[PDB]
mmCIF file of N, CA and C in Angstrom:
data_model
loop_
_atom_site.group_PDB
_atom_site.id
_atom_site.type_symbol
_atom_site.label_atom_id
_atom_site.label_comp_id
_atom_site.label_asym_id
_atom_site.label_seq_id
_atom_site.Cartn_x
_atom_site.Cartn_y
_atom_site.Cartn_z
ATOM 1 N N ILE A 1 -19.775 -0.933 5.353
ATOM 2 C CA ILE A 1 -18.744 -1.227 5.957
ATOM 3 C C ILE A 1 -17.097 -1.562 4.731
ATOM 4 N N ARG A 2 -15.957 -0.770 4.370
ATOM 5 C CA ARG A 2 -15.434 -0.893 3.607
ATOM 6 C C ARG A 2 -13.394 -1.373 4.700
ATOM 7 N N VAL A 3 -13.124 -2.110 4.311
ATOM 8 C CA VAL A 3 -11.991 -1.955 4.816
ATOM 9 C C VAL A 3 -10.490 -2.460 4.534
ATOM 10 N N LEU A 4 -9.761 -1.857 4.870
ATOM 11 C CA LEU A 4 -8.257 -2.895 4.515
ATOM 12 C C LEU A 4 -7.281 -3.129 5.389
ATOM 13 N N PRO A 5 -7.332 -4.207 5.790
ATOM 14 C CA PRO A 5 -5.860 -4.651 6.974
ATOM 15 C C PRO A 5 -4.431 -4.350 6.955
ATOM 16 N N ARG A 6 -3.893 -4.475 7.951
ATOM 17 C CA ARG A 6 -2.377 -4.896 7.928
ATOM 18 C C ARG A 6 -1.561 -5.431 8.825
ATOM 19 N N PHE A 7 -1.114 -6.155 8.342
ATOM 20 C CA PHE A 7 -0.210 -6.615 10.303
ATOM 21 C C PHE A 7 0.718 -5.827 10.765
ATOM 22 N N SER A 8 1.421 -5.115 11.488
ATOM 23 C CA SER A 8 2.460 -5.095 12.312
ATOM 24 C C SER A 8 3.125 -6.149 13.153
ATOM 25 N N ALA A 9 4.785 -5.576 13.161
ATOM 26 C CA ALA A 9 5.340 -6.294 13.762
ATOM 27 C C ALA A 9 5.360 -6.679 14.676
ATOM 28 N N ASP A 10 4.726 -5.208 15.153
ATOM 29 C CA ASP A 10 4.388 -5.562 17.141
ATOM 30 C C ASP A 10 2.893 -6.523 17.614
ATOM 31 N N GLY A 11 2.204 -7.387 16.867
ATOM 32 C CA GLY A 11 1.405 -7.269 17.075
ATOM 33 C C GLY A 11 0.262 -6.518 16.957
ATOM 34 N N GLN A 12 0.444 -5.146 16.511
ATOM 35 C CA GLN A 12 -1.431 -4.573 15.664
ATOM 36 C C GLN A 12 -0.908 -4.824 14.409
ATOM 37 N N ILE A 13 -2.661 -4.387 14.422
ATOM 38 C CA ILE A 13 -3.277 -4.462 13.646
ATOM 39 C C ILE A 13 -3.999 -2.891 13.079
ATOM 40 N N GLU A 14 -3.468 -2.158 11.742
ATOM 41 C CA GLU A 14 -3.362 -1.025 11.528
ATOM 42 C C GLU A 14 -5.088 -1.622 10.129
ATOM 43 N N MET A 15 -5.802 -0.626 9.810
ATOM 44 C CA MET A 15 -6.725 -0.746 8.909
ATOM 45 C C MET A 15 -7.628 0.827 8.699
ATOM 46 N N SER A 16 -7.530 0.499 7.386
ATOM 47 C CA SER A 16 -8.167 2.069 6.623
ATOM 48 C C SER A 16 -9.476 1.493 6.655
ATOM 49 N N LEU A 17 -10.202 2.696 6.746
ATOM 50 C CA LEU A 17 -11.342 2.134 7.200
ATOM 51 C C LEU A 17 -12.578 3.564 6.625
ATOM 52 N N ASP A 18 -13.584 3.041 6.084
ATOM 53 C CA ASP A 18 -14.771 3.701 5.515
ATOM 54 C C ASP A 18 -16.123 2.846 6.187
ATOM 55 N N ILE A 19 -16.863 3.866 6.305
ATOM 56 C CA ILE A 19 -18.241 3.265 7.259
ATOM 57 C C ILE A 19 -19.106 4.070 7.125
ATOM 58 N N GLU A 20 -20.440 3.788 6.665
ATOM 59 C CA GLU A 20 -21.780 4.835 6.216
ATOM 60 C C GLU A 20 -23.209 3.884 7.360
ATOM 61 N N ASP A 21 -23.799 4.588 8.221
ATOM 62 C CA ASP A 21 -24.104 4.120 8.475
ATOM 63 C C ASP A 21 -25.664 5.119 8.369
ATOM 64 N N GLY A 22 -26.897 4.326 8.990
ATOM 65 C CA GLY A 22 -28.276 4.828 8.999
ATOM 66 C C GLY A 22 -29.307 4.237 8.822
ATOM 67 N N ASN A 23 -30.803 5.672 8.839
ATOM 68 C CA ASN A 23 -31.806 4.480 8.632
ATOM 69 C C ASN A 23 -32.768 5.682 7.221
ATOM 70 N N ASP A 24 -33.280 5.303 6.686
ATOM 71 C CA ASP A 24 -34.080 5.923 5.022
ATOM 72 C C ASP A 24 -34.930 6.818 5.973
ATOM 73 N N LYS A 25 -34.608 8.521 5.417
ATOM 74 C CA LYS A 25 -36.101 9.590 5.250
ATOM 75 C C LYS A 25 -36.903 9.001 4.754
ATOM 76 N N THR A 26 -37.951 9.533 5.796
ATOM 77 C CA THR A 26 -39.037 8.903 5.494
ATOM 78 C C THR A 26 -40.261 10.061 5.716
ATOM 79 N N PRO A 27 -40.471 11.030 5.327
ATOM 80 C CA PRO A 27 -41.452 11.860 4.582
ATOM 81 C C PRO A 27 -42.856 11.011 5.314
ATOM 82 N N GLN A 28 -43.057 10.169 4.411
ATOM 83 C CA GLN A 28 -44.104 9.698 4.370
ATOM 84 C C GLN A 28 -44.888 8.747 5.156
ATOM 85 N N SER A 29 -43.824 8.330 6.783
ATOM 86 C CA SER A 29 -44.317 8.251 7.476
ATOM 87 C C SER A 29 -45.016 9.483 8.236
ATOM 88 N N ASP A 30 -46.435 9.973 7.705
ATOM 89 C CA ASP A 30 -47.311 10.911 8.508
ATOM 90 C C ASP A 30 -47.857 11.053 9.489
ATOM 91 N N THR A 31 -47.953 9.278 10.229
ATOM 92 C CA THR A 31 -49.092 9.038 11.237
ATOM 93 C C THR A 31 -47.992 9.883 12.636
ATOM 94 N N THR A 32 -49.633 10.932 13.643
ATOM 95 C CA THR A 32 -49.161 10.962 14.538
ATOM 96 C C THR A 32 -48.817 10.082 15.216
ATOM 97 N N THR A 33 -50.317 8.935 15.475
ATOM 98 C CA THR A 33 -51.462 8.179 15.886
ATOM 99 C C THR A 33 -49.619 6.911 16.601
ATOM 100 N N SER A 34 -49.386 6.830 15.147
ATOM 101 C CA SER A 34 -47.525 6.448 15.697
ATOM 102 C C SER A 34 -46.267 7.119 16.112
ATOM 103 N N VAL A 35 -46.784 7.221 17.437
ATOM 104 C CA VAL A 35 -45.886 7.699 18.735
ATOM 105 C C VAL A 35 -44.705 6.933 19.176
ATOM 106 N N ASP A 36 -45.552 5.441 18.851
ATOM 107 C CA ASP A 36 -44.114 4.653 19.252
ATOM 108 C C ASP A 36 -43.005 4.038 17.860
ATOM 109 N N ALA A 37 -43.131 5.432 17.925
ATOM 110 C CA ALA A 37 -42.304 5.282 16.087
ATOM 111 C C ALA A 37 -40.859 4.211 16.186
ATOM 112 N N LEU A 38 -40.253 3.537 15.527
ATOM 113 C CA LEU A 38 -39.886 2.701 15.315
ATOM 114 C C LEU A 38 -38.425 4.379 15.183
ATOM 115 N N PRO A 39 -37.196 3.523 16.064
ATOM 116 C CA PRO A 39 -36.715 4.634 16.539
ATOM 117 C C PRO A 39 -35.561 5.467 15.955
ATOM 118 N N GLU A 40 -35.235 6.938 15.857
ATOM 119 C CA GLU A 40 -35.148 7.535 14.780
ATOM 120 C C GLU A 40 -33.357 7.899 14.515
ATOM 121 N N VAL A 41 -32.249 6.947 14.224
ATOM 122 C CA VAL A 41 -31.026 7.496 14.271
ATOM 123 C C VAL A 41 -30.710 8.297 13.365
ATOM 124 N N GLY A 42 -29.392 8.692 13.395
ATOM 125 C CA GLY A 42 -28.761 9.889 12.555
ATOM 126 C C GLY A 42 -29.044 8.939 11.199
ATOM 127 N N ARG A 43 -28.298 9.622 10.236
ATOM 128 C CA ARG A 43 -26.986 9.412 8.800
ATOM 129 C C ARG A 43 -25.375 10.124 9.376
ATOM 130 N N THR A 44 -25.023 8.144 8.970
ATOM 131 C CA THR A 44 -23.099 9.005 9.206
ATOM 132 C C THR A 44 -21.967 8.399 8.548
ATOM 133 N N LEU A 45 -21.393 9.282 8.442
ATOM 134 C CA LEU A 45 -20.338 8.897 7.522
ATOM 135 C C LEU A 45 -18.765 9.321 7.594
ATOM 136 N N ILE A 46 -17.488 7.848 8.399
ATOM 137 C CA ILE A 46 -17.047 8.444 8.885
ATOM 138 C C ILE A 46 -15.989 7.751 7.900
ATOM 139 N N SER A 47 -14.704 7.876 7.364
ATOM 140 C CA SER A 47 -13.435 7.797 6.823
ATOM 141 C C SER A 47 -11.880 7.812 7.886
ATOM 142 N N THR A 48 -11.236 7.413 8.128
ATOM 143 C CA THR A 48 -9.838 7.066 8.231
ATOM 144 C C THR A 48 -9.374 6.133 8.722
ATOM 145 N N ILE A 49 -8.052 6.120 9.101
ATOM 146 C CA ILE A 49 -7.506 5.420 9.819
ATOM 147 C C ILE A 49 -6.998 5.042 11.212
ATOM 148 N N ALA A 50 -6.841 3.545 11.699
ATOM 149 C CA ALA A 50 -6.588 3.445 12.532
ATOM 150 C C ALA A 50 -5.851 1.813 13.114
ATOM 151 N N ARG A 51 -4.603 2.017 14.283
ATOM 152 C CA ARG A 51 -3.706 1.085 14.670
ATOM 153 C C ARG A 51 -4.329 0.646 16.037
ATOM 154 N N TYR B 1 64.448 -16.146 -24.623
ATOM 155 C CA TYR B 1 63.298 -16.431 -23.389
ATOM 156 C C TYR B 1 62.389 -14.869 -22.828
ATOM 157 N N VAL B 2 63.176 -13.917 -23.260
ATOM 158 C CA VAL B 2 62.670 -12.656 -23.442
ATOM 159 C C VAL B 2 61.666 -12.412 -23.844
ATOM 160 N N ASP B 3 61.520 -13.052 -25.314
ATOM 161 C CA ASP B 3 60.958 -12.953 -26.574
ATOM 162 C C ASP B 3 59.673 -12.938 -26.342
ATOM 163 N N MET B 4 59.560 -14.828 -25.877
ATOM 164 C CA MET B 4 58.668 -16.070 -25.835
ATOM 165 C C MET B 4 58.307 -15.334 -24.275
ATOM 166 N N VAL B 5 58.518 -14.459 -23.122
ATOM 167 C CA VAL B 5 57.685 -14.984 -21.989
ATOM 168 C C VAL B 5 56.683 -13.186 -22.441
ATOM 169 N N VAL B 6 57.045 -12.062 -23.104
ATOM 170 C CA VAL B 6 56.863 -10.955 -23.519
ATOM 171 C C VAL B 6 55.434 -11.088 -24.414
ATOM 172 N N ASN B 7 55.747 -12.717 -25.546
ATOM 173 C CA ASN B 7 54.009 -12.527 -26.817
ATOM 174 C C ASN B 7 53.869 -13.041 -25.752
ATOM 175 N N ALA B 8 53.677 -14.562 -24.987
ATOM 176 C CA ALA B 8 53.040 -15.598 -24.329
ATOM 177 C C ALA B 8 52.102 -14.437 -23.157
ATOM 178 N N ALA B 9 52.769 -13.418 -22.290
ATOM 179 C CA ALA B 9 51.944 -12.733 -21.994
ATOM 180 C C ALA B 9 51.296 -11.642 -22.267
ATOM 181 N N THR B 10 51.426 -11.233 -23.682
ATOM 182 C CA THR B 10 51.363 -10.691 -24.502
ATOM 183 C C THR B 10 48.687 -10.622 -25.215
ATOM 184 N N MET B 11 49.716 -12.332 -25.411
ATOM 185 C CA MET B 11 48.770 -13.350 -25.415
ATOM 186 C C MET B 11 47.353 -13.517 -24.968
ATOM 187 N N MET B 12 48.181 -13.888 -23.525
ATOM 188 C CA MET B 12 46.883 -14.725 -22.470
ATOM 189 C C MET B 12 46.376 -13.299 -22.095
ATOM 190 N N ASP B 13 46.599 -11.805 -22.072
ATOM 191 C CA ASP B 13 46.060 -10.714 -21.345
ATOM 192 C C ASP B 13 44.874 -10.331 -22.309
ATOM 193 N N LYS B 14 45.102 -10.828 -23.700
ATOM 194 C CA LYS B 14 43.602 -10.136 -24.221
ATOM 195 C C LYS B 14 42.753 -11.407 -25.193
ATOM 196 N N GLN B 15 42.695 -12.422 -24.635
ATOM 197 C CA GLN B 15 41.891 -13.965 -24.591
ATOM 198 C C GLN B 15 41.702 -13.877 -23.450
ATOM 199 N N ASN B 16 42.119 -13.448 -21.827
ATOM 200 C CA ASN B 16 41.323 -13.268 -20.481
ATOM 201 C C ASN B 16 39.920 -12.257 -21.471
ATOM 202 N N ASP B 17 40.383 -11.640 -21.841
ATOM 203 C CA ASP B 17 39.636 -9.917 -21.643
ATOM 204 C C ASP B 17 38.191 -9.779 -21.979
ATOM 205 N N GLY B 18 37.166 -11.439 -22.594
ATOM 206 C CA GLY B 18 35.955 -11.581 -22.793
ATOM 207 C C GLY B 18 35.529 -12.043 -21.150
ATOM 208 N N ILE B 19 35.688 -12.120 -20.004
ATOM 209 C CA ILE B 19 35.253 -12.290 -18.910
ATOM 210 C C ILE B 19 34.711 -11.083 -18.133
ATOM 211 N N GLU B 20 33.952 -11.148 -17.898
ATOM 212 C CA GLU B 20 32.338 -10.465 -17.624
ATOM 213 C C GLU B 20 32.633 -10.360 -16.069
ATOM 214 N N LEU B 21 32.462 -9.229 -15.478
ATOM 215 C CA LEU B 21 32.766 -8.973 -13.486
ATOM 216 C C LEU B 21 32.229 -8.922 -13.172
ATOM 217 N N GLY B 22 31.173 -7.515 -13.743
ATOM 218 C CA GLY B 22 30.296 -6.872 -12.783
ATOM 219 C C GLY B 22 28.904 -7.264 -12.978
ATOM 220 N N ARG B 23 28.045 -7.797 -12.012
ATOM 221 C CA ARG B 23 26.789 -8.147 -11.535
ATOM 222 C C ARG B 23 25.596 -7.472 -10.905
ATOM 223 N N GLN B 24 24.772 -7.199 -11.259
ATOM 224 C CA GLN B 24 23.320 -7.531 -10.384
ATOM 225 C C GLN B 24 22.644 -7.926 -9.757
ATOM 226 N N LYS B 25 22.186 -7.547 -8.477
ATOM 227 C CA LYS B 25 21.485 -8.347 -7.301
ATOM 228 C C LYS B 25 20.054 -7.478 -6.376
ATOM 229 N N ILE B 26 19.287 -8.398 -6.308
ATOM 230 C CA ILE B 26 18.129 -8.188 -5.957
ATOM 231 C C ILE B 26 17.696 -7.710 -4.359
ATOM 232 N N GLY B 27 17.303 -7.418 -4.372
ATOM 233 C CA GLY B 27 17.521 -7.083 -2.481
ATOM 234 C C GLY B 27 15.686 -6.974 -2.145
ATOM 235 N N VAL B 28 15.151 -7.966 -1.591
ATOM 236 C CA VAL B 28 13.592 -8.182 -0.535
ATOM 237 C C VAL B 28 13.585 -7.161 0.597
ATOM 238 N N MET B 29 12.472 -6.277 0.685
ATOM 239 C CA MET B 29 12.680 -5.838 1.663
ATOM 240 C C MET B 29 10.612 -5.068 2.143
ATOM 241 N N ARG B 30 10.303 -5.672 3.364
ATOM 242 C CA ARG B 30 8.744 -5.788 3.569
ATOM 243 C C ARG B 30 9.250 -4.006 4.691
ATOM 244 N N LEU B 31 8.244 -3.377 4.157
ATOM 245 C CA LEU B 31 7.917 -2.925 5.386
ATOM 246 C C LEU B 31 6.933 -2.967 6.689
ATOM 247 N N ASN B 32 7.403 -2.565 7.052
ATOM 248 C CA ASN B 32 6.795 -2.640 9.194
ATOM 249 C C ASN B 32 5.777 -1.270 9.708
ATOM 250 N N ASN B 33 5.605 -0.368 8.906
ATOM 251 C CA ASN B 33 4.736 0.469 9.330
ATOM 252 C C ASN B 33 3.866 1.548 8.544
ATOM 253 N N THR B 34 4.018 1.217 7.316
ATOM 254 C CA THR B 34 3.419 1.928 6.100
ATOM 255 C C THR B 34 2.819 0.947 4.843
ATOM 256 N N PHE B 35 1.985 1.648 4.778
ATOM 257 C CA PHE B 35 1.653 0.964 3.097
ATOM 258 C C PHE B 35 2.517 1.361 1.966
ATOM 259 N N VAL B 36 2.895 -0.014 0.963
ATOM 260 C CA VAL B 36 4.126 0.203 -0.120
ATOM 261 C C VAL B 36 2.988 0.475 -0.524
ATOM 262 N N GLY B 37 2.480 0.888 -1.500
ATOM 263 C CA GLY B 37 2.022 1.580 -2.430
ATOM 264 C C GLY B 37 1.213 2.571 -2.598
ATOM 265 N N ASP B 38 1.044 3.641 -3.163
ATOM 266 C CA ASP B 38 0.901 5.285 -3.252
ATOM 267 C C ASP B 38 -0.563 5.050 -2.901
ATOM 268 N N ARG B 39 -1.157 5.599 -1.998
ATOM 269 C CA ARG B 39 -2.003 5.714 -1.164
ATOM 270 C C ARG B 39 -3.477 5.881 -1.206
ATOM 271 N N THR B 40 -4.753 6.149 -1.596
ATOM 272 C CA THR B 40 -5.959 6.894 -2.372
ATOM 273 C C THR B 40 -6.806 6.995 -0.602
ATOM 274 N N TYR B 41 -7.334 7.701 -0.386
ATOM 275 C CA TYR B 41 -7.962 8.408 0.948
ATOM 276 C C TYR B 41 -9.254 8.536 -0.201
ATOM 277 N N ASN B 42 -10.882 8.518 0.229
ATOM 278 C CA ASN B 42 -11.603 8.917 0.003
ATOM 279 C C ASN B 42 -12.632 10.542 0.669
ATOM 280 N N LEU B 43 -12.780 11.439 0.503
ATOM 281 C CA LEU B 43 -13.092 12.191 1.205
ATOM 282 C C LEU B 43 -15.089 11.892 0.796
ATOM 283 N N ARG B 44 -16.186 12.455 1.574
ATOM 284 C CA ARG B 44 -16.527 12.783 1.412
ATOM 285 C C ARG B 44 -17.386 11.562 0.021
ATOM 286 N N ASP B 45 -16.863 12.715 -1.153
ATOM 287 C CA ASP B 45 -17.689 12.875 -2.453
ATOM 288 C C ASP B 45 -17.050 12.696 -3.682
ATOM 289 N N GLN B 46 -15.164 12.351 -3.284
ATOM 290 C CA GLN B 46 -13.385 12.292 -3.666
ATOM 291 C C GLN B 46 -12.941 11.674 -3.227
ATOM 292 N N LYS B 47 -11.688 10.919 -4.151
ATOM 293 C CA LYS B 47 -10.591 10.303 -4.094
ATOM 294 C C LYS B 47 -10.033 11.211 -3.939
ATOM 295 N N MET B 48 -8.347 11.152 -3.386
ATOM 296 C CA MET B 48 -7.254 11.747 -3.057
ATOM 297 C C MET B 48 -6.377 11.198 -2.667
ATOM 298 N N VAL B 49 -5.143 11.866 -3.640
ATOM 299 C CA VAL B 49 -4.105 10.355 -3.796
ATOM 300 C C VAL B 49 -2.044 11.478 -3.315
ATOM 301 N N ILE B 50 -1.997 10.161 -2.213
ATOM 302 C CA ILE B 50 -0.662 10.488 -2.075
ATOM 303 C C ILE B 50 0.754 9.296 -2.448
ATOM 304 N N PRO B 51 1.651 9.793 -2.860
ATOM 305 C CA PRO B 51 2.867 9.306 -3.117
ATOM 306 C C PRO B 51 3.512 8.525 -2.636
#
Protein backbone atom coordinates (compact mmCIF):
# COMPACT_ATOMS: atom_id res chain seq x y z
CA ILE A 1 0.00 0.00 0.00
CA ARG A 2 1.15 3.52 -0.83
CA VAL A 3 -1.02 6.41 0.30
CA LEU A 4 -1.33 10.17 0.75
CA PRO A 5 -4.21 11.56 2.95
CA ARG A 6 -6.01 14.94 2.93
CA PHE A 7 -8.54 16.50 5.34
CA SER A 8 -11.53 18.25 3.77
CA ALA A 9 -13.52 20.79 5.79
CA ASP A 10 -16.68 18.71 5.32
CA GLY A 11 -15.18 16.12 7.66
CA GLN A 12 -14.16 13.93 4.71
CA ILE A 13 -10.80 12.26 4.12
CA GLU A 14 -9.36 12.06 0.60
CA MET A 15 -6.60 9.59 -0.27
CA SER A 16 -4.35 9.03 -3.24
CA LEU A 17 -3.95 5.24 -3.34
CA ASP A 18 -1.66 2.63 -4.89
CA ILE A 19 -2.51 -0.98 -4.00
CA GLU A 20 -0.68 -4.13 -5.09
CA ASP A 21 -1.57 -7.61 -3.91
CA GLY A 22 -1.23 -11.29 -4.65
CA ASN A 23 0.85 -14.42 -4.37
CA ASP A 24 3.94 -15.66 -6.14
CA LYS A 25 3.60 -17.66 -9.35
CA THR A 26 4.92 -21.14 -8.58
CA PRO A 27 5.20 -23.67 -11.42
CA GLN A 28 7.53 -25.60 -9.11
CA SER A 29 4.50 -26.70 -7.08
CA ASP A 30 4.12 -29.53 -9.58
CA THR A 31 2.43 -31.89 -7.13
CA THR A 32 -0.94 -33.48 -7.86
CA THR A 33 -1.08 -35.10 -4.42
CA SER A 34 -1.65 -31.67 -2.92
CA VAL A 35 -5.13 -31.05 -4.21
CA ASP A 36 -5.35 -29.39 -0.80
CA ALA A 37 -3.32 -26.58 -2.30
CA LEU A 38 -3.02 -23.29 -0.53
CA PRO A 39 -5.75 -21.17 -2.16
CA GLU A 40 -4.71 -19.51 -5.42
CA VAL A 41 -5.56 -15.85 -5.23
CA GLY A 42 -4.75 -13.67 -8.22
CA ARG A 43 -2.34 -10.77 -8.62
CA THR A 44 -3.84 -7.30 -8.77
CA LEU A 45 -2.80 -3.66 -9.18
CA ILE A 46 -5.03 -0.65 -8.56
CA SER A 47 -4.28 3.05 -8.46
CA THR A 48 -6.91 5.73 -7.89
CA ILE A 49 -8.19 8.59 -5.72
CA ALA A 50 -11.21 8.36 -3.42
CA ARG A 51 -13.06 10.56 -0.93
CA TYR B 1 4.59 87.90 3.15
CA VAL B 2 4.03 86.50 -0.34
CA ASP B 3 7.72 85.69 -0.86
CA MET B 4 8.09 83.99 2.51
CA VAL B 5 4.99 81.87 1.90
CA VAL B 6 6.05 80.74 -1.56
CA ASN B 7 9.60 79.90 -0.48
CA ALA B 8 8.63 77.96 2.64
CA ALA B 9 6.00 75.97 0.74
CA THR B 10 8.37 75.01 -2.06
CA MET B 11 11.05 73.86 0.40
CA MET B 12 8.58 71.81 2.45
CA ASP B 13 7.51 70.08 -0.73
CA LYS B 14 10.91 68.77 -1.74
CA GLN B 15 11.82 67.85 1.83
CA ASN B 16 8.85 65.51 2.30
CA ASP B 17 9.55 63.81 -1.07
CA GLY B 18 11.53 60.87 0.39
CA ILE B 19 8.40 59.49 2.12
CA GLU B 20 7.68 56.03 0.67
CA LEU B 21 3.99 55.05 0.67
CA GLY B 22 3.56 51.99 -1.60
CA ARG B 23 3.63 48.69 0.31
CA GLN B 24 3.25 44.96 -0.42
CA LYS B 25 1.24 42.44 1.62
CA ILE B 26 1.08 38.65 2.03
CA GLY B 27 -2.20 36.72 1.81
CA VAL B 28 -2.41 33.09 2.98
CA MET B 29 -5.08 30.90 1.34
CA ARG B 30 -5.87 27.27 2.18
CA LEU B 31 -7.40 24.98 -0.43
CA ASN B 32 -10.21 22.77 0.87
CA ASN B 33 -10.99 20.56 -2.13
CA THR B 34 -7.78 19.86 -4.07
CA PHE B 35 -4.05 19.26 -3.72
CA VAL B 36 -2.01 22.46 -3.94
CA GLY B 37 1.05 21.05 -5.69
CA ASP B 38 1.63 19.70 -9.16
CA ARG B 39 0.11 16.27 -9.08
CA THR B 40 1.71 12.97 -10.08
CA TYR B 41 -0.16 9.77 -10.83
CA ASN B 42 1.63 6.50 -11.51
CA LEU B 43 0.22 4.38 -14.30
CA ARG B 44 1.13 0.71 -14.36
CA ASP B 45 4.72 1.49 -15.35
CA GLN B 46 4.83 5.27 -15.69
CA LYS B 47 4.45 8.49 -13.76
CA MET B 48 2.44 11.27 -15.41
CA VAL B 49 1.99 14.76 -14.05
CA ILE B 50 -0.59 17.56 -14.12
CA PRO B 51 -0.12 21.32 -13.54
